[PDB]
Amino acid sequence: AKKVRTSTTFRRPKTLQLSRKPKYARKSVAHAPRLDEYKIIVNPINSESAMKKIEDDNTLVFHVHLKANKFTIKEAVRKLYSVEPVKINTLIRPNGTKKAFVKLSADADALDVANRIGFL
Amino acid sequence: KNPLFVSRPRSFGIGQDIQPKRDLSRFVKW
Amino acid sequence: ARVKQKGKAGAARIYITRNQALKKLQLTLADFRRICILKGVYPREPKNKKKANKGSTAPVTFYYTKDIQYLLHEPIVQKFREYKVFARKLSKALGKGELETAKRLEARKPTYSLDHIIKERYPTFHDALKDIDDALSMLFLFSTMPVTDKIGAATVANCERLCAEFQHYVIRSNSLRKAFLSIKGIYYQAEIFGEQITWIVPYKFAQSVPTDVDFRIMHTFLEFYQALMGFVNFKLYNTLGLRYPPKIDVNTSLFSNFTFFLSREVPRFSLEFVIRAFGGKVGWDITHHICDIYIQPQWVYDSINKGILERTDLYACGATLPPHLSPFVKEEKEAKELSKMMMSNKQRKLYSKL
Amino acid sequence: PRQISDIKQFLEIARRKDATSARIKKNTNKDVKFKLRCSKYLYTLVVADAKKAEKLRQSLPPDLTVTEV
Amino acid sequence: APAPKLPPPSHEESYNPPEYSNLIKEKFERCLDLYLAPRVRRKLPTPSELRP
Amino acid sequence: KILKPGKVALITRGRFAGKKVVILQAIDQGSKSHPFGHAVVAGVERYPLKVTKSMGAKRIARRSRVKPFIKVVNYNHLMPTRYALELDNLKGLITADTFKEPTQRSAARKTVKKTFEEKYQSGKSAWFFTPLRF
RNA sequence: GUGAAUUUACUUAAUCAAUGAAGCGGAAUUUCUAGCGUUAAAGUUUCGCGAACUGAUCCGCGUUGA
RNA sequence: GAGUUCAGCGGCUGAAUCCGGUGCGCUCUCGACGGCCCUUGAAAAUCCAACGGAAGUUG
RNA sequence: GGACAUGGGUUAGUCGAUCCUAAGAGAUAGGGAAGCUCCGUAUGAAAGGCACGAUUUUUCGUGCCUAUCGAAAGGGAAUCCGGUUAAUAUUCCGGAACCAGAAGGUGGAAUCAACACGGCAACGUAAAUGAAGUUGGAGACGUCGGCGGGAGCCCUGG
C-alpha cells in the first residue's frame, strides 16, 4: 500500500512529546511568597497633603513596595486593615519610592482607620 | 431513481474545472 | 490594557472540544475514550455552543478543560504507554523467534490498578453502592454468554466469582426485596444500606454474538466494574467478618417450612436464588412439585410481592393468569386562555406533556 | 443623558432596581424637571404642567430617594 | 459526579398485560450513554363579575 | 411579446436579484398604482440544496424544501429567458386584489410553495430550480 | 567520468535557470462579454452524506529545463 | 443647580446671564472640482462585509 | 534669587509608552573563517496546524493547508465640563459619559411555510442562524489653485 501524496511537500511528522518527569526536584524547598502584605505596605504617609486627603477624600496614603501593583495593594489593605478600598491610585515619587492613594468606601471612615493604624 | 440526483460531471482539462487530488509522490520535495 | 481579543475567556476558555482534548492529552481516540470510561468524564454542552466554539457553528462535543487538565496527571496514561512499549517488545521477540524472552515478557506484562480511580470516582462507599446497578447488569449479562475470541475466559471466571459472592451476600442478608418477570428477563430489586439496586438477569439460553457491538467498550467497562465489585464485596465481607474470597462453589421464614424440589424443566439458576433469597429450602435433581398441590411459577412471585402466600386455585397448572403487574410501576376556558404577552414565560409545554 | 417624553416610562424606570435617586428641579419658567439617576443614564422628564408635577411626585415610589433643587 | 440518571424501570409489559436477542444492544447503548451522552442535573383577572 | 404568463425570467434589481422567476401575469399596459410596464412574478427565494444517492428520506426531504416569493417587478428590472414554466395551478391566482388582500398574498405564496414542491419532486424545470452563480 | 567508429554520443560528478520541487519519460489510448468555478456525484459493488471501486488509465519513478 | 456679572446681609438672600444681524475678513475644517508630473506621491496590526452552504407541543 | 538650608510635591480603563509595521536591524537553516567572528532572513530546513471517527488487530487511523527588534511626530478602542492645592490634573473632587472583554439573566424578534418583511427600483426596518474555503473593502496616503459649507474669532444693531 503506497501512500498517496497530494501536497508535493513533505512536512515533518508529529511525534509524541512526553512531559517532564524528573527523578529529583531541582529545588528542595519552594520559596515563600516573595511579596506578602507586610512587604507590600511599607508605611503610611502623614504629611499635610496626606492628612487633607484623609479628612476630605476618604483616602489613605501609603508608602508601598515598588513591585506592588493596584491589585496587590487592595488585597494587602483588605487583609491588613479589614477595610475594602473602592479605588487605588499609584505614583512613583522622585525619590524612587511608590506611593498609593487608597480611596475607601462610604462604608468605611478613613479618619477612623487612620486612628487604628496609629499614625493620625 | 429519484430525478433530483442528476449527474453534474466534472471536466478536468486545461482551463476547465480544478484538477482533482492526484498522487504527487514523484514530485515531492523529499 | 490593550483591546482583549474575543474567544480568550469564558465559555471559550472553560470548554474544550474532543479533538483539541486529544491533542492536549497526546492520546488516541480509543485511549482517550478508555480513560473517560475509567474516570468520570462525559461531554458537557455549553449554554452558548457557538460562543464556546470561538464563533464556529459546526456540531461539537465539549468537555470541561478542568476535566482534561486533570487527565494530564493520570498515572493510567503512562501505563498505556508502557503497554505499547511492551507490545512492541513482545512483537519484536516473536518476529526474531525469541520464544523464551516472549514468555518472560508475557510474565512481566505491565498491568495497572484501579484502586485510585475507584476512590476518586466514588469518594463514599454509599456513592459506590448507589452506582452499582449498571455494574451488576453488565456482569450478570456477560456471565451467561459463551466465551469467544473477544471475551477472555479468565474475565468470565472473575465475573462468575463476583456475581456468586454478591448473590450469596444477598442470600445471607435477606436483602432481596422484589423480583419482576419481563420479556427482557428478570429484574431483581434489593436493598442494602438504604440504597436500592435493580439489575436484570437474562435467561440461561444458547444465544449468539450480535456482531454489531464493540466489545472493547464492554472490556473497559467490565474491567472497571470487576475492580469495583472486588473492592465493594471485600468491604462487605470484612464488615460482617467472613473470609473473602469465599471458597463456596456457588418475612425471613416465608418458605422455611417448605422443602422445594426442582425438576428439569424450570430455570433452576434463578429459582434457587429467589427461593433461598427468602430462606427457603431447595433440593435439585416433598411438599410442592414444581412443573410447568400443583401451582404455577407466578404464584410464588405474586406471593413474595404481596408478602403473603397467594391462592392456589388462581395459579393451578393450566388455569388463567391475571396480568403480571410490575411493582416498579407506580373558569377552565379563561384559565387555559390567559396567555398575555409573556413569550418565554409561557410554560404550556408542561400542560402539553404532563 | 437621556430625555424621557413619557410619564409612565419615568415611573417604570423608577420602579426598575437600577434607579438610585431622583431630583426635582423647579425652573424660573414654572417648568419642572424630574431627573432619575440610574446605573448608566440620567433620565430626565420635563413636565411643564403643575398639576401633573405633584401627582407624579406622589406617584414616585416611597423607597426612592427624592431630592429638592 | 452528577448521577447518570438511571433508566426508567419496567413499563408494565409482561406475559399478558392489558396495557430477547436485542438485550446486548440496549446494554451496549446504555454503556455508550454513560460516556457519550452529556449529563445535566436539573394572577386572577376574574372576568365573571366584570361582565360587560 | 417575449414576456408572457408562463415565461421564466431573471430579476436584476431589488432584494431578489439574481433569482429566477416565472411570469404569472403581465401588465405591460401599466396601472395607476404602478405607472410602468410591470409584471407580477413568482420566484424561488431559497433554492433547494443538492441531493445524493445517500442520505435518508428525512434529509432528502429536508433539503428539497423550497421557499418562494411573489413580487410585482418592472420590465426593466426583469431579464427575460428562453425557458418556459407552466402549470394550471398557477394560472390566474394572482392579481392586484391579491396584493391588496394580505391574506390572499400569503395564501398565494403558500400555493406557489406547494406547486414548486410537486414540480421539484417530479424533476421538471431543473434549470429553474438550480441557483444561478454570479 | 562512461561509451560507439579524431570522430560522435551519454550523464552520475560539477555549472546554470525555474518552482508551492504538479502533471517528466514511456505504454495504453478552456477564445463574442471585467461573471461563478472550492467543501464530488453520478456509475458499479457491499452494507447513510457509513463504505469500497472507478469517476480522475497503467508503468517507470530522474522535481523540471538548458 | 454651573460659570460670569451686579445689589444687599451676617455663610446667606435678591436680580441679570436677552433678541438679533453681516462678510473677496482671519484660523481650522469639510465639500465638490481644476491643474501638474520621463515625479503618480508607505506598509502592517486591527476592523467590517460579501460569495459559499457545513451544521442544526418542544426546542 | 534657578544660590544655601529644611521639608513638601507629579494620583489615568479613556493622555502617551506598551500594539503595529517603515527604512533598517537581527537570530535560526546553512556556508565561510586559524580565529575574534563573517555572510545569510522561507534560503539547498523534516522550519505546524486544523478537522472527522459506536474504540482502530483496546500498539490511530482518514482527510485538508515567514522569528524578533525597530515611530512618546506614522497606523491606532474609548472623557467631557465645572471645581479644587503653597506646589498635581482630560489623572484628584463633584457631575455627566464612553470603550473593550466576559458570563449567564430579563424583555422582545425568527422558527412545524426551518433561518424576518416592505419598496417597480435606488434601498429601508429593533432584531432577522451561516462552519471550512475564497474574495472585497476600510486602515491607506502627493502637491498646487481658486469655489462653496461649518465652527471659533473679528465686526455690528438694540
Side-chain angles (χ1 to χ4, degrees), chain C residues 206-217:
Chain C
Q207 302 95 15
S208 64
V209 55
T211 69
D212 290 323
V213 301
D214 293 358
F215 300 107
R216 287 159 292 183
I217 314 291

Side-chain angles (χ1 to χ4, degrees), chain A residues 5 8 10, chain B residues 24-30:
Chain A
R5 306 307 200 95
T8 278
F10 183 99
Chain B
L24 302 188
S25 307
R26 85 165 312 275
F27 308 103
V28 180
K29 197 174 187 299
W30 291 102

Side-chain angles (χ1 to χ4, degrees), chain C residues 332-348 351, chain E residues 43 45:
Chain C
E332 186 175 356
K333 186 256 288 181
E334 292 299 85
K336 186 69 176 176
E337 187 263 327
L338 196 142
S339 57
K340 299 289 94 176
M341 166 172 168
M342 296 127 75
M343 290 262 273
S344 64
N345 196 2
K346 297 183 182 70
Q347 292 296 319
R348 57 188 60 250
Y351 310 127
Chain E
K43 52 192 177 295

